[PDB]
């Protein structure tokens, strides 16, 4: 039982590699839509509204 | 609870919200209420503590269309083991039942020390019918409740008056209390009694009595299961 128990806890490279695809997908999505998202954030910041309080 | 509402409704999950130290939450309210110098209720608690506790508690339930639900189990610790305290009183008035943990049972060494008599489940009537569980669930529950109350009364009678004065029914009910507390309620962690197995054990408890004495059991169920 002790020998089998030791092998279970050593398993971490498979888990690390499993998420490695997710990081690549996130990086790809970011590299794809950075231009659009940053541009719309810039539009929002640059274009304010001179709105007086309703009351 | 807003996280639980989001999950259960907008995500269609089955959330089991577990609040602990609702008494500590009410103490926080009292600290805020006392600082505001508002007119206090019982024991200095805010007069709107019922409304605040109701706002917290009533965020649990099933909703039409949504396939999710919230099942709150707020762990309330009564301050002086007195159910008449404002926090347990309002919590029991708002919520749909209560699980009562008994200091006397804990001293006796029973785990879980759930004192079934003060405990209540208002949805047991609709959730413990035929089809959902066995046809004997309600009758067995009512009979166990009646016999456990008779057992407590018989224990008080044995403590006050002499034991020999106890009738045959009183002695049988004392034995029922002993085996109910020390075999049925006592479960230990990780035991995992299925509802049907628990009902079978409850019937084993109820088989002590003759079928004539079992008043709360309907005759059809008594014939079928005894």
């Amino acid at each position: 039982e002790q020998k089998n128990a030791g092998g279970v806890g050593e398993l971490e490279k498979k888990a690390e590699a499993g998420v490695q695809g997710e990081l690549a997908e996130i990086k790809k999505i970011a590299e794809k839509k950075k231009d659009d998202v940053v541009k719309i954030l810039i539009e929002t910041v640059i274009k304010p509204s001179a709105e007086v309080h309703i009351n | 609870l807003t996280t639980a509402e989001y999950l259960a409704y907008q995500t269609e999950r089955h959330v089991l919200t577990i609040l602990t130290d609702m008494s500590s939450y009410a103490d926080a309210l009292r600290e805020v209420s006392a600082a505001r110098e508002e007119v206090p209720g019982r024991r200095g608690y805010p007069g709107y503590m019922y409304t605040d506790l109701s706002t917290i508690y009533e965020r649990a339930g099933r909703v039409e269309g949504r396939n999710g639900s919230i099942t709150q189990i707020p762990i309330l610790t009564m301050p002086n083991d007195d159910i008449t305290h404002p926090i347990p009183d309002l919590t029991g008035y708002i919520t749909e039942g209560q699980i009562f943990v008994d200091r006397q049972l804990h001293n006796k060494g029973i785990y879980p020390p759930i004192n079934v008599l003060p405990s209540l489940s208002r949805l047991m009537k609709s959730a413990i019918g035929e089809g959902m569980t066995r046809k004997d669930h309600g009758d067995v529950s009512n009979q166990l409740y009646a016999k456990y109350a008779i057992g407590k009364d018989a224990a008080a009678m044995k403590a006050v008056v002499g034991e020999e004065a106890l009738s045959i029914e009183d002695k049988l009910s004392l034995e029922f209390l002993e085996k109910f507390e020390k075999t049925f309620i006592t479960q230990g962690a990780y035991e995992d009694r299925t509802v049907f197995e628990s009902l079978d054990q409850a019937w084993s408890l109820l088989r002590i009595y003759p079928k004539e004495m079992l008043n709360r059991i309907s005759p059809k169920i008594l014939d079928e299961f005894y």
Binding site: - | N80, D81, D82, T84
Partner: protein, 49 residues
Amino acid sequence: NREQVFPTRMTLGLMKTKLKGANQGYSLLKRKSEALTKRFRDITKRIDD
């Protein structure tokens, strides 16, 4: 030297009822003891005879 009862109006009324019942039982059992003591004295005299 006091019962472990949570102070409440319902508890107070229950304990007043318990006190009244205890006094009634005290009086009734003392009278029963007196009657049985008279019967026991008669039984002792009859036993000697």
